[PDB]
Structure 1
Amino acid sequence: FKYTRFEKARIIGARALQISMGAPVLIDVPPGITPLEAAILEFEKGVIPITVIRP
């Protein structure tokens, strides 16, 4: 299994939206960063709750 770049983009978008809305961050982040790089770091660490469903 390998994430296509479209799947990765959608996962990052959804995670960033959830973080902005008020969801807790699963990892510690440096202060003064926007939700987007927070989600990017979350993905880079490999800690992602969202999963994709393929036909």
Structure 2
Amino acid sequence: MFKYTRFEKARIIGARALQISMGAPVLIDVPPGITPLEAAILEFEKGVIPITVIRP
């Protein structure tokens, strides 16, 4: 997006990790044995993010 503050990045990664843990599929191939959180960081770094942030 335009620019992601620290809090917004943390929130997005946390939400994606929770969704992945609860059963959501991963849209990026990942190495075996990774925790859901690190899968979320890999997904964010790849740039594919499905969660947008609402600004006032």
Shorter-chain-normalised TM-score: which range? over 0.9
Distance 1:39 1:52 in 2: 17
Structure 1 residue ranges, 4+ long, deviating more than 3 angstroms after superposition: none
Describe the SS at the equivalent of 2:39: helix
Describe the SS at the equivalent of 2:55: coil
Query: What are the superposed Cα offsets for residues 1-55 of structure 1, whole Å, 9 maximum, x if unpaired?
Result: 1000100000000000000000000000000010000000000000000000000
Describe the SS at the equivalent of 2:52: strand
Distance 1:14 1:34 in 2: 14
Percent identity (aligned): 100
What root-mean-square deviation, in Å, do the aligned CA atoms of Structure 1 and Structure 2 show?
0.3
In structure 2, list runs of 5 or more residues that go unmatched.
Answer: none
Q: TM-score by structure 2 length?
A: 0.97
Give the number of equivalent residue pairs.
Answer: 55
Q: TM-score by structure 1 length?
A: 0.99
